[PDB]
Amino acid sequence: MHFETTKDGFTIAIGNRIILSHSPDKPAFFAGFGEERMDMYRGNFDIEDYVIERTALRHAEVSVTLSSAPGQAPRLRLTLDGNAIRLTALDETINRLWLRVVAETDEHVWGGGEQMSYFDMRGRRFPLWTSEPGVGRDKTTEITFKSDVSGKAGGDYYNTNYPQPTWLSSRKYALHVETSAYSVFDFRNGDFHEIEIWAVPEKIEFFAGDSFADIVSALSLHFGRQPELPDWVYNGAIIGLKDGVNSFARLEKIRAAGTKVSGLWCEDWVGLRQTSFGARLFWDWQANDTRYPHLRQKIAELADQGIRFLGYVNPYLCVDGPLFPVAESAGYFATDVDGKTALVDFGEFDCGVVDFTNPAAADWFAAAIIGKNMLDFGLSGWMADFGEYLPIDIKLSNGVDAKLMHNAWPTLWAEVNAKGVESRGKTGEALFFMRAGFTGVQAHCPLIWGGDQSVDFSRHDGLVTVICGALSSGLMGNAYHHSDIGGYTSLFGNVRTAELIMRWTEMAAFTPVMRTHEGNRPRDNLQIDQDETVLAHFARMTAIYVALAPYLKSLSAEAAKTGLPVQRPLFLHYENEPQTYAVQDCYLYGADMLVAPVWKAGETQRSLYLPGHGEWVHLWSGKRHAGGRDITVETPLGEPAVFYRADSSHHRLFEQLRTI
Numbered sequence: 001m002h003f004e005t006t007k008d009g010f011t012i013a014i015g016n017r018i019i020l021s022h023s024p025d026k027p028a029f030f031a032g033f034g035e036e037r038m039d040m041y042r043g044n045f046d047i048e049d050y051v052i053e054r055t056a057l058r059h060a061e062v063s064v065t066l067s068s069a070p071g072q073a074p075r076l077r078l079t080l081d082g083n084a085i086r087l088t089a090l091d092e093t094i095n096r097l098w099l100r101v102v103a104e105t106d107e108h109v110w111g112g113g114e115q116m117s118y119f120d121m122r123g124r125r126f127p128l129w130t131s132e133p134g135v136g137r138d139k140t141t142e143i144t145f146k147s148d149v150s151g152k153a154g155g156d157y158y159n160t161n162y163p164q165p166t167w168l169s170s171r172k173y174a175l176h177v178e179t180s181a182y183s184v185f186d187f188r189n190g191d192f193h194e195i196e197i198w199a200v201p202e203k204i205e206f207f208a209g210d211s212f213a214d215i216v217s218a219l220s221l222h223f224g225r226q227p228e229l230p231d232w233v234y235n236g237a238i239i240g241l242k243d244g245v246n247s248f249a250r251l252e253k254i255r256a257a258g259t260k261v262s263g264l265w266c267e268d269w270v271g272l273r274q275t276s277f278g279a280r281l282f283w284d285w286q287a288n289d290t291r292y293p294h295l296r297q298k299i300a301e302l303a304d305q306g307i308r309f310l311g312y313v314n315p316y317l318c319v320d321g322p323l324f325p326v327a328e329s330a331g332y333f334a335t336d337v338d339g340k341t342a343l344v345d346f347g348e349f350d351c352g353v354v355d356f357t358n359p360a361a362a363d364w365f366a367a368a369i370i371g372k373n374m375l376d377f378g379l380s381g382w383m384a385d386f387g388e389y390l391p392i393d394i395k396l397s398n399g400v401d402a403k404l405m406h407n408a409w410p411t412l413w414a415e416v417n418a419k420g421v422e423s424r425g426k427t428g429e430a431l432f433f434m435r436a437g438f439t440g441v442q443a444h445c446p447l448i449w450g451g452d453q454s455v456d457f458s459r460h461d462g463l464v465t466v467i468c469g470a471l472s473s474g475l476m477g478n479a480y481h482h483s484d485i486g487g488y489t490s491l492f493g494n495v496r497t498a499e500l501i502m503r504w505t506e507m508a509a510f511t512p513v514m515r516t517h518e519g520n521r522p523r524d525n526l527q528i529d530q531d532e533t534v535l536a537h538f539a540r541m542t543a544i545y546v547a548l549a550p551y552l553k554s555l556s557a558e559a560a561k562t563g564l565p566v567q568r569p570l571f572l573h574y575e576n577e578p579q580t581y582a583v584q585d586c587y588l589y590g591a592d593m594l595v596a597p598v599w600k601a602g603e604t605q606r607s608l609y610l611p612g613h614g615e616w617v618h619l620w621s622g623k624r625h626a627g628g629r630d631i632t633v634e635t636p637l638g639e640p641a642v643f644y645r646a647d648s649s650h651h652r653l654f655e656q657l658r659t660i
């Protein structure tokens with residue numbers, strides 16, 4: 001950065017780009033004090049602040065100290081240090097800070113973690129607090145209304161399992177706030193962005209470069225990159241079943257249709273806790289002999305067939321399981337204000353929270369559960385779930401306020417998984433996937449999944465939200481994203497259709513990982529093995545995925561070398577084309593393919609903007625289309641709107657896909 005004096009105050013810039021501007025009349029910082037309410041109900045948060053003070057820091061003295069007015073005691077010190085602005089609270093009573101960053105009227109801003117509704121965040125406000133993302137997520141839909149009424153569970157456009165206080169600006173810089181406190185990105189004003197933080201962050205860090213790609217590279221180096229995808233993934237789809245021993249018979253039927261399979265993922269490897277409300281799992285992280293009486297043998301048999309086995313784990317322990325008394329005896333649970341084990345309500349059962357701030361507890365979970373019970377048992381991967389349910393009234397062994405540990409949790413959890421994996425020498429071979437995140441998850445977690453979508457084509461909780469989650473999380477340095485094929489949440493009569501499964505499968509073939517899921521109510525929802533048309537369509541798309549493996553491998557190698565995500569926004573490679581900047585329902589699958597998933601029912605065609613000044617080749621027909629215009633193509637089931645660059649080095653490969 002470059003600091004510079006002006007008539008009335010100062011500016012801070014990154015090269016050509018003014019970032020902060022301060023004068024008494026147009027101050028950069030405001031400081032104050034609030035009393036928040038943050039009530040948790042089954043991982044949903046009802047958050048409302050009561051602001052008692054918000055006071056402009058109008059007087060700057062030059063390292064810069066800031067006070068409310070001349071002759072008042074300084075409240076904030078700002079120190080420029082390389083690409084960082086370091087902040088020190090001089091008034092210990094501040095628990096609210098607002099920072100204005102200079103903005104241009106037509107500027108776009110992206111990132112914010114994994115955003116599910118809006119990719120370009122301009123014009124709206126985005127609180128950053130990990131939680132349940134919501135069912136429906138749109139106060140105008142009946143699903144959302146019903147979820148709010150029954151369980152405070154509808155959420156809204158800004159809720160996410162993985163927030164992050166980082167943005168990329170169309171002005172060619174990125175900004176990162178180093179804090180785990182609650183924060184908000186307010187992009188509602190034309191002339192400035194405003195950051196609200198419920199703390200004085202240690203620093204704000206900046207990244208700039210001459211391309212957006214270069215900035216994403218630099219961000220990915222800052223947060224940490226992922227290993228390349230393991231070879232075994234490229235064998236096909238990961239088939240999600242939760243049907244006990246019957247899972248194997250159903251897998252055989254799936255394989256008999258020609259489906260290419262890399263793995264069998266059985267989240268019920270620990271037992272099902274079937275309830276009147278849903279087919280839940282038994283949260284005790286060891287193989288269940290009642291549900292899978294020969295599981296060790298079955299894993300070995302599948303391995304001989306070239307199919308891996310994957311499970312399920314989360315960082316909580318159910319009160320009625322055998323691991324709970326072990327963890328409690330050792331003092332490894334978060335505690336309540338009286339020093340007893342704090343129990344969290346997950347609906348049909350209560351759990352303890354393994355306290356990862358206690359190094360012994362974190363080591364125990366990595367060694368006993370990830371190491372012995374999972375990896376040594378023969379798992380090649382798993383869903384590494386949750387991370388969002390830390391309540392703010394719980395006590396942690398490190399003595400740090402739960403208001404600050406809440407957002408840190410997903411990263412601590414990712415690190416426990418990564419340490420277990422590394423302890424067995426399996427980094428880059430074991431594949432675990434997380435839905436929750438925060439700053440730093442990038443370094444530990446090798447694969448994101450989009451969490452729970454409704455089983456529908458809705459705008460704010462259906463298929464299309466996955467694309468937004470992939471694009472946003474990709475710019476934040478998570479190179480690999482995928483989703484549950486066919487979505488997850490079935491409530492209030494909302495159930496899958498054949499069409500939904502097929503469209504979702506079409507997208508998933510052009511992402512790093514194809515994975516199915518029977519969902520929360522398996523017997524109420526269509527599954528890939530239960531309709532012959534769906535199953536044949538699925539098998540065909542898995543053959544397309546396998547044929548594409550050499551190209552996906554090259555993208556994984558690129559991700560390791562340069563940090564660029566596999567699924568990229570159009571603007572990353574077409575910077576001079578304004579119409580690419582807000583597009584969030586299409587992506588570049590590497591530089592050489594363009595994917596425009598169908599995300600509504602009953603569509604026989606798809607319209608999209610084709611970028612560039614060359615030619616794109618339609619994957620299924622071989623017909624050529626000129627870049628630089630809107631086009632419409634036929635998209636019958638099995639033929640998603642996918643194109644490849646005419647000049648691609650992988651053209652011989654892409655030509656073959658037409659034939660399969």
Ligand SMILES: O=S(=O)(O)C[C@H]1CNC[C@@H](O)[C@@H]1O
Pocket residue numbers: 267278279280281282385452488517519520
């Ligand atoms: O029903 S359970 O809560 O036990 C398991 C679910 C948890 N969230 C993610 C889903 O994919 C799981 O099926």
Ligand SMILES: [K+]
Pocket residue numbers: 133134135136452453454461
């Ligand atoms: K959701």
